[PDB]
């Protein structure tokens, strides 16, 4: 469960990294950071797409990616972080 | 279920596209992108309303639109993406 | 239920409007718009607090306000928007 | 329950305060404010990391912190705010 969502999240972030590095000219690290900041809905806006291709991709990436990323966050919190916290209390 | 939320999401995004293109002077593609970035709560701020009409509309659009857009995202994730993922594992 | 959350949301937004208009010098309409953009987690950043008082208030306002605003949005979506949609289908 | 999430949220925010004050050169109050604005997903972008260290930390901080912060917000809303509201109605 967690492993599948972890792998899917990595793949989704790799896709954004490649897209934004190529089409929007970002350094790969900036493209990865931007992809994370986007799909977690933080949205600083220090980076944002300038091209119409980038804007269209971003629309679709948000709709397809938010569900996966927040599914991963939920499983991380409930199946990894929560048991680790409980274990520390004993 | 999914079809109804899909159609409602398209209609909601068309409404924002028309509003922001007219009142805020955005290109239609920018107005659509801004509407998506708003209702998914990303909020880059590369675009934001400059007129009081735009600010008032945005308040109401957020309150009326977030529930529909995140209902659609939830149904997309659970009723489309999840079964597709499970099918790939077999 | 819905009425109580509606009133609480209005009161919470009035509080932010008064605070940001006074301490951060915003026009009341801008303060209301900023309060909404904050508590719905959109966060354009076209407005943001410049004073330390404003930053401290914003921290506490977010933590106390997000739960109320998203409780209201949930009740709006499920108890008002959903039945209205279903009624249109018949 | 609430106490544990409260303490964990404080610890998580202290960690961000120390990190962003040191690596990104922010005043401690700005680092705390930025940490809150990040983990609640508001993301104004008035502050954002400029260094690659800061961007990498921010990616990991978001993934590890969102679950804790929104767990705390949920418990605050349902176990503290809700009973206080109900008590006011009698
Ligand atoms: K945001
Ligand atoms: K958000
Ligand atoms: K934002
Ligand atoms: K922003």
Numbering used by the authors:
A (entry chain A), B (entry chain A), C (entry chain A), D (entry chain A): 23 to 112
How did the manuscript describe this experimental structure?
The introduction of Asp66Tyr and Asn68Asp mutations in the NaK amino acid sequence causes main-chain conformational changes of the GYG residues in the selectivity filter. The NaK channel shares a high amino acid sequence homology and a similar structure with the bacterial KcsA potassium ion channel from S. lividans, but its selectivity filter adopts a different conformation. Both NaK and KcsA are tetrameric ion channels composed of four identical polypeptide chains which form a symmetrical structure. The selectivity filter displays a high selectivity for potassium ions over sodium ions and is formed from four contiguous and chemically equivalent binding sites.
The overall protein structure of NaK2K remains similar to the previously reported structure (a RMSD of 0.28 Å for all Cα atoms). However, the increased resolution of our structure enabled us to visualize several unseen alternative conformations, such as Phe92, which has an important role in regulating the flow of ions through the selectivity filter. Within the asymmetric unit of the crystal are two identical polypeptide chains (A and B). When the fourfold symmetry of the I4 space group is applied, three additional symmetry-related molecules are generated to form an intact potassium ion channel from each of the two polypeptide chains in the asymmetric unit. In the A polypeptide chain, at the bottom of the selectivity filter on the intracellular side Phe92 is observed in a dual conformation, with the A conformation having a refined occupancy of 68% and the B conformation having a refined occupancy of 32%. In the B polypeptide chain within the unit cell, Phe92 is again in dual conformation, with a refined occupancy of 69% for the A conformation and 31% for the B conformation. The A conformation (68% occupancy) corresponds to an enlarged pore conformation of the ion channel in its open form while the B conformation (32% occupancy) corresponds to a restricted form of the open form of the ion channel.
